[PDB]
């Protein structure tokens, strides 16, 4: 028997699951602006325009669409960035004060949703009282009993940052993420991967594609499309405790609008601290809305419904109307220009197997689906238009305690950034690269002593 | 003479004193107490279940317990860690309003008082009731027995954040990389001079310190007999710390069931104060296992004589002063009770010690940011044990050997923490060095 | 050619201009001086000279990112020190003011009554405090009542008086991988190569100058006063004069007594001037007239040399705002103003009368003042003049013998340059190739 020795050159394809940290890689454009979220990409590292991607060949690797860390860390990073953004902004405890509100005025040349509200409020000098005057939405206020239906701040009970800061808030842009040296990103690729178990078309990745951590409630916007057919995924689609996400293979046209308006009156309350007032509507007063053809909705929903019927055993289960929820859940929201739209999705949901969804706008929101503190979106001068970005749908499910299995209502949910972002992020996995140049074989070291 | 070269290759571990930083580690789990910042508040690492130790056959080492400065670093960190946990949480400055009260349904320690506060909407002022302790208020003339907050005109007015209990967690240290712990591992070592069973220690022991005064509770015990140590008891300028070889049970209860009421401090704030009492209103006390205590007194008395020449009668009661030096105390679940310890030592050589609660305290016995300790409903039990005490001679004694009176003392928490560090040093290791050896010179050209 | 093979030898220097972060360093040992605030790195017990015998290096007095870094640090330190301290707005509320009566001059000192709403919710108590001539805003529709100047859109107060500052000679220096080089080149023109360049392990300590016109208590020039500018023909630039010999200043207190405060809350107090002992009009600065005049004679001569003629360099009045008219100074942390146009009058022992202003505009971009707490006891100040900053502009010439140079000013950055003008921080870098005829003794 030949006698042995140990060692090979390292770089042998041996790896372990990584701890999770995300190395921010910028688009090399972020440095040219004056707004938040993009500023976090300014304070980031621009990467290589042509990243290395290498197929592992005869290898499978385990990917899990509903598991582990990567999105959770993004969740926390975004919250921390959000808080850093708002920490410098004013809280205005006195903003809670009840105002006398009447309907919004216009020229004489829908209901009273927007009102002209006013109050006598103590200003930066403690012995001076100024007249407050601003426009407010019913959705942001609470009427007072036995007081001429006057109104108080709706979020007054909680911690409120009464400023998003008009020179700060902005929509997030895509960020590429890199593994730290010693780590690598693997991606499944694999057209139509089921979401669990071994992936057969896996490659090594020198940083992810840019992933945009943008906000919408329930409906996925500004992401990526399925390669051929809609992709319907759940950890267990027959487990009613789980909910199913659907990726579109075709984008859906979106045309959302919000009418032209002004901003005005920085009203000082404190020593260099003020409320920034909603200005007048310019021209006619109308609600926000979205215009989408039913052709696109039906073509995708039909494919989805047929696939669900097949996934569940050729059942007669269909896409159907929502059960409701909190107003922020019933309506499907999005952020354009910093404005928050809440659209009435029942236009699409009140169906079984030029559509215009009225949309509400609201100034006081929590970030995402987080709880505790609240903040508001300052008024935006000009008009807002949002378009052509539906890339995925809404998480859907049902329950049921009926004896019959003939019917089922797949109703919407989601808006949780971990689940929303995970639906695309999961393609990637991060592993630790161990340079284990180790292996026994035959022969001896050329030793003199 | 042969040609020499003086050198030692890296790996002969010369010891230098360590000057800074400890590695915090614990028997970590996804505990609600980490979530709630109960003691350790953040980066304390899950520890090594099997720390190593190396006994060095030829090593003995000079040790001085009062030089265990790593204790100062730990005390400063617990202050900073809790200071961070308490910000911007529960600011109670706006609540200094007057209170009007005479009684509650012993003396009127706790009274049911009325007051108004504004906040939580600037359009309104609201009157309410809550219970207050005499220990935390100052009387005001001519208004139905009015009171102001005792902290009203001083420092910072705050509260412990209500989700946070303060149960000591036995977090230990393993020192940072490049450092090790050197432990004495022997018996009857006096805290000074060399100790002899010296070993390399990876990690030592978790500690569970509490806010206390005269009393050291839930610490470690002595191996055979009560152990009395002081840097130098020659002077009355030094303090004597006594470790027991047996613990003595501590048994206090609320002893009644209270409720909690809200304080509407402001938008988004934590809102809690002391509420109503369910059942009879009863006086707190601890039921102390006096028989065991008395055996410890006999041993303490003996050690206070053995170390003191031919002196005979030793030890007596305290000289008085503020509760922080006079009464023993325990922050039971964050409830800062002070108990009248007199029955434990009203002499020279079952116990039930009445207790009172101070709700606004400086938990570090300094800083000044005294915080209110709100209750949680219902009655509680404070199950703990005595592991040691603080004593010192007054030096105001007469000139005979017949008596030497030591009285209950007190000190910084870090002074009691040194009792753990008593057995070990943190060492910095620098393995590269020199030594002459016959050595061949390399000649290139 | 020969086998001129590539090798890489380094261990001999090369360097680049540094863009790094420098640290506070001093004879570090409670800090009640903001310039250190709470902590500072111990100093270098053995600075070395170390001369680059055959090397010159290109320096530029007006291009130094480290002076800019010092600014970022002074601002940070001002804020860090008072950031956790008390900010007060009840003080915005007006006061009833009257002239102060002293023991037996305009209404320069006033006794004002303020309505105090602090301590307890149902009480408001009027009380007296003293204020100086550099008062706040008078009320247009009332009789000698005043509102706070520093209110409006700001809150300004000595949030925590225990800590303040007096300039301390704190130095600073480079992190690992960096070094500081200095000019030992006498009478350097401020631009281009320095003949004699040597090392700086760390810099000389610097005592910040927070005011205009004069540079006090700094370093001196050797032999002669030195006048320098980025551009001496560009009137937009300020010319700085370093003195070779200093001029003595000794300032005297208006009184010797106390201060009062308003209880705002449990750890919150506001200070105003208390009882007065002495004739308050007496505050003054005693400056040697002869030395100032001789100092100017030397300055005038150097200026004449710089124009090439027997010029007149006239001290026409400048500023238009006391903060930029007077070299005010923070003696004891409180700002004193005197008469800079008395010391240097319309020419080319002097005793200046002095006044106190507690609300003084900071160099910070926010445009806010710092509030100086009143000082109990008495004010005694001494320093020597070590430099002068001058300005000339407007086109008011028409003669080769006529110029108008009068006290000017610039930033704290420009005042700090007095020391930084002598050195540059550079990055230590490895070198490239040391090629030669050799070949490696390869087995392969």
């Amino acid at each position: 028997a030949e006698q042995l020795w140990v060692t090979v050159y390292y770089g042998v394809p041996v790896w372990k699951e990584a701890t999770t940290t995300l190395f921010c890689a910028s688009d090399a454009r972020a440095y040219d602006t004056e707004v938040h979220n993009v500023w976090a990409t300014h304070a980031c590292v621009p990467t290589d325009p042509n990243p290395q991607e290498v197929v592992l060949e005869n290898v499978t690797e385990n990917f899990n669409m509903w598991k582990n860390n990567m999105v959770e860390q993004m969740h926390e990073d975004i919250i921390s960035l959000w808080d850093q953004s708002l920490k410098p902004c004013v809280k205005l405890t006195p903003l809670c004060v009840t105002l006398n509100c009447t309907d919004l005025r216009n020229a004489t040349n829908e209901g009273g949703e927007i009102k002209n509200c006013s109050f006598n409020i103590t200003t930066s000098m403690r012995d001076k009282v100024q007249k407050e005057y601003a426009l407010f939405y019913k959705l942001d206020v609470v009427p007072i009993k036995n007081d001429n239906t006057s109104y108080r701040l709706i979020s007054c009970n909680t911690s409120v940052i009464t400023q998003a800061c008009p020179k700060v808030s902005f929509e997030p842009i895509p960020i590429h993420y890199c593994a730290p040296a010693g780590f690598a990103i693997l991606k499944c690729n694999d057209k139509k991967f089921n979401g669990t178990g071994p992936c057969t078309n896996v490659s090594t990745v020198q940083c992810t594609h840019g992933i945009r951590p943008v906000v919408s409630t329930q409906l996925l916007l500004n992401g990526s499309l399925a390669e051929e057919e809609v992709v319907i995924r759940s950890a267990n689609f027959t487990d009613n405790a789980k909910i199913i996400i659907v990726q579109l293979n075709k984008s859906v046209e979106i045309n959302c609008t919000r009418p032209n308006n002004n901003t005005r009156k920085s009203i000082h309350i404190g020593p260099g601290r003020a409320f920034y007032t909603t200005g007048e509507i310019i021209g006619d007063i109308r609600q926000a809305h979205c215009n989408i053809s039913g052709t696109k909705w039906n073509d995708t929903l039909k494919q989805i419904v047929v696939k669900l019927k097949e996934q569940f055993g050729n059942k007669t289960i269909v896409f159907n109307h929502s059960s409701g929820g909190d107003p922020e859940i019933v309506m499907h929201s999005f952020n354009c220009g910093g404005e928050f739209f809440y659209c009435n999705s029942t236009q699409l949901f009140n169906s079984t197997w030029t559509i215009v969804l009225p949309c509400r706008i609201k100034q006081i929101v929590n970030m995402w689906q987080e709880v505790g503190k609240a903040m508001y979106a300052p008024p935006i001068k000009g008009q807002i238009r949002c378009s052509s970005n539906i890339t995925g749908l809404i998480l859907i499910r049902d329950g049921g305690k009926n004896r019959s299995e003939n019917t089922e209502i797949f109703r919407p949910g989601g808006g949780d950034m971990r689940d929303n972002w995970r639906s695309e992020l999961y393609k990637y996995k991060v592993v630790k690269i161990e340079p284990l140049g180790i292996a026994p074989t035959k022969a001896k070291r050329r030793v003199v002593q | 003479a042969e040609q020499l070269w003086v050198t030692v290759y890296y790996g002969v571990p010369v010891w230098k004193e360590a000057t800074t930083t400890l590695f915090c580690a614990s028997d970590a789990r996804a505990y609600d107490t980490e979530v709630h910042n109960v003691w350790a508040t953040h980066a304390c690492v899950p520890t090594d279940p099997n720390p190593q130790e190396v006994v060095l056959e030829n090593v003995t080492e000079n040790f001085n317990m009062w030089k265990n400065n790593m204790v100062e670093q730990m005390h400063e960190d617990i202050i900073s860690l809790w200071d961070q946990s308490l910000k911007p949480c529960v600011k109670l400055t706006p609540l200094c309003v007057t209170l009007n009260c005479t009684d509650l349904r012993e003396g009127g320690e706790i009274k049911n008082c009325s007051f108004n506060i504004t906040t939580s909407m600037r359009d309104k002022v609201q009157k309410e009731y809550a219970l207050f302790y005499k220990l935390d208020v100052v009387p005001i003339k001519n208004d139905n027995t009015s009171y102001r907050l005792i902290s009203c005109n001083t420092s910072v007015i705050t509260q412990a954040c209500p989700k946070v209990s303060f149960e000591p967690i036995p977090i230990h240290y393993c020192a940072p990389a490049g450092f090790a712990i050197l432990k004495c591992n022997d018996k009857k070592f006096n805290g000074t001079g060399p100790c002899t069973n010296v070993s390399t220690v990876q990690c030592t022991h978790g500690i569970r310190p509490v806010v206390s005064t005269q009393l050291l509770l839930n610490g470690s015990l002595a191996e055979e007999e009560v152990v009395i140590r002081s840097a130098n008891f020659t002077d009355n300028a030094k303090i004597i710390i006594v470790q027991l070889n047996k613990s003595v049970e501590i048994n206090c209860t609320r002893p009644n069931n209270n409720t909690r009421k809200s304080i509407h401090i402001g938008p988004g704030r934590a809102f809690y104060t002391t509420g109503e009492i369910i059942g009879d209103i009863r006086q707190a006390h601890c039921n102390i296992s006096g028989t065991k205590w008395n055996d410890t007194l006999k041993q303490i008395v003996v050690k206070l004589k053995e170390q003191f020449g031919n002196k005979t009668i030793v030890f007596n009661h305290s000289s008085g002063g503020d509760p922080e030096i006079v009464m023993h105390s325990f922050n039971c679940g964050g409830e800062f009770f002070y108990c009248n310890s007199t029955q434990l030592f009203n002499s020279t050589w079952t116990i039930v010690l009445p207790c009172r609660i101070k709700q606004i305290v400086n938990m570090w016995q300094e800083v000044g940011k005294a915080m209110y300790a709100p209750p949680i409903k219902g009655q509680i039990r404070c199950s703990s044990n005595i592991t040691g005490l603080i004593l010192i001679r007054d030096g105001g004694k007469n000139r005979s050997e017949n008596t030497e009176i030591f009285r209950p003392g007190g000190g910084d928490m870090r002074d009691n923490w040194r009792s753990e560090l008593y057995k070990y040093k943190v060492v910095k290791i620098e393995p590269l060095g020199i030594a002459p050896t016959k050595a061949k010179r390399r000649v290139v050209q | 050619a020969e086998q001129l093979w590539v090798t890489v030898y380094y261990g001999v220097p090369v360097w680049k201009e540094a863009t790094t972060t420098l640290f506070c360093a001093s004879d570090a040992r409670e800090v009640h001086n903001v310039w250190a605030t709470h902590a500072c790195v111990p100093t270098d017990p053995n600075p070395q000279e170390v001369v680059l015998e055959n090397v010159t290096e290109n320096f530029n007095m007006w291009k130094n990112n480290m002076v800019e870094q010092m600014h970022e640090d002074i601002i940070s330190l001002w804020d860090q020190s008072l950031k956790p301290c008390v900010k007060l707005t009840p003080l915005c509320v007006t006061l009833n003011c009257t002239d102060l009566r002293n023991a037996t001059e305009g209404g320069e000192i006033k006794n004002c009554s303020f309505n105090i709403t602090t301590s307890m919710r149902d009480k408001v108590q009027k009380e007296y405090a003293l204020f100086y001539k550099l008062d706040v805003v008078p009320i247009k529709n009332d009789n000698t009542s005043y509102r706070l100047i520093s209110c409006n859109t700001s809150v300004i107060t000595q949030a925590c008086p225990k800590v303040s500052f007096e300039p301390i000679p704190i130095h600073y220096c480079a992190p690992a991988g960096f070094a500081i080089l200095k000019c030992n080149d006498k009478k350097f023109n401020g631009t281009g190569p320095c003949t004699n360049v040597s090392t700086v392990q760390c810099t000389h300590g610097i005592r910040p100058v927070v005011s205009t016109q004069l540079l006090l208590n700094g370093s001196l020039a050797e032999e002669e006063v030195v006048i320098r500018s980025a551009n001496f023909t560009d009137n937009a630039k300020i010319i700085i004069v370093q003195l070779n010999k200093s001029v003595e200043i000794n300032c005297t207190r208006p009184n010797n007594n106390t201060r009062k405060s308003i209880h705002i809350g449990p750890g919150r107090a506001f200070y105003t001037t208390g009882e007065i002992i002495g004739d308050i009009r007496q505050a003054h600065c005693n400056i040697s007239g002869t030395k100032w005049n001789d100092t100017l004679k030397q300055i005038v001569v150097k200026l004449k040399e710089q124009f090439g003629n027997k010029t007149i360099v006239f001290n026409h009045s400048s500023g238009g705002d006391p903060e930029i008219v007077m070299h005010s100074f923070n003696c004891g942390g409180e700002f004193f103003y005197c008469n800079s146009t008395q010391l240097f009058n319309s020419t080319w022992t002097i005793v200046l009368p002095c006044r106190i202003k507690q609300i003084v505009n900071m160099w910070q971009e926010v445009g806010k003042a710092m509030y100086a707490p009143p000082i109990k006891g008495q004010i005694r100040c001494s320093s020597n003049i070590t430099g002068l900053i001058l300005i000339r502009d407007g086109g008011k010439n028409r003669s080769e013998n006529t110029e108008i140079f009068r006290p000017g000013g610039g930033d704290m950055r420009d005042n700090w340059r007095s020391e930084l003008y002598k050195y540059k921080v550079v990055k230590i870098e490895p070198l490239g190739i040391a090629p030669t005829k050799a070949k490696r003794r390869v087995v392969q």
Partner: antibody, heavy 140, light 112 residues
């Protein structure tokens, strides 16, 4: 129109007393202030003192300070003016206020936690036409 | 503050205007704005009647014979077309922040 009720005319001996009961029909007084005067024959009016329906009260004319005490029946919405030490010079027809006062304030001051240091209680809002009023005289 | 009403007696030709005045030797205004103006009339056989003239406010029933204005230390009331119906004593009301009392009383009569 509210019927304004007052005690009927009376004559008292010097140094004596009378009580004037001013009931507002319909109990309108519960929403109105009361302020009371004297009009001697051939003379103008003077107030003796004031009370709100809210219970805020003070004398006004510094000559009745110990001569007139004003109270009320909050159930019957009736105000009682008790006059003491009546003399010949007190012969007059007495009248109660109609109309109202508002709690006017014109000094605003709040601290950071919002305590109210406002100065208020000025300004009559409306004027007082009363009904007949009642004569009180003194004789012997 | 005090109040007087010069000339305190105005016999008139019926149909002639009256000019009544108030002097208080105190500067009066609502502290919050305009001066407080009020007046009342007590005709023989009557309880007071109101003639408020509070810039824009008059008691219901006041005819256009009556109008007035003022501020500071004084004010006036003009009565156009004075008739026998207007005979009585005219009282000028004080301001409302000292606090307030009543007028002096000016008699207006038709000349015999």
């Amino acid at each position: 129109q509210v019927q304004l009720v007052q005690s009927g005319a009376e004559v008292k001996k010097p140094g004596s007393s009378v009580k004037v009961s001013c009931k507002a029909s319909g109990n309108s007084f519960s929403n109105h202030d009361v302020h009371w005067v004297r009009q001697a024959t051939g003379q103008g009016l003077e107030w003796m003192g004031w009370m709100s329906h809210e219970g805020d009260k003070t004398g006004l004319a510094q000559k009745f300070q110990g001569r007139v005490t004003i109270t009320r029946d909050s159930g019957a919405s009736t105000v009682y003016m008790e006059l003491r030490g009546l003399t010949a010079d007190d012969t007059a027809i007495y009248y109660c206020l109609t109309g109202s006062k508002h709690r006017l304030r014109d000094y605003f001051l709040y601290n950071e936690y919002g305590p109210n240091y406002e100065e208020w209680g000025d300004y009559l809002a409306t004027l007082d036409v009363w009904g007949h009023g009642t004569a009180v005289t003194v004789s012997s | 503050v005090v109040i007087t009403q010069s000339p305190l007696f105005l016999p008139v030709t019926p149909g002639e205007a009256a000019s009544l005045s108030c002097k208080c030797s105190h500067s009066l205004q609502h502290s919050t704005g305009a001066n407080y103006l009020a007046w009342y009339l007590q005709r023989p056989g009557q309880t007071p009647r109101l003639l408020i003239h509070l810039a824009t406010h008059r008691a219901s029933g006041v005819p256009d014979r009556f109008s007035g204005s003022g501020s500071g230390t004084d004010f006036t009331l003009k009565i156009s077309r004075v008739e026998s119906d207007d005979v009585g004593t005219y009282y000028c009301m004080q301001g409302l922040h000292s606090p307030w009392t009543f007028g002096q009383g000016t008699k207006v009569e038709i000349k015999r």
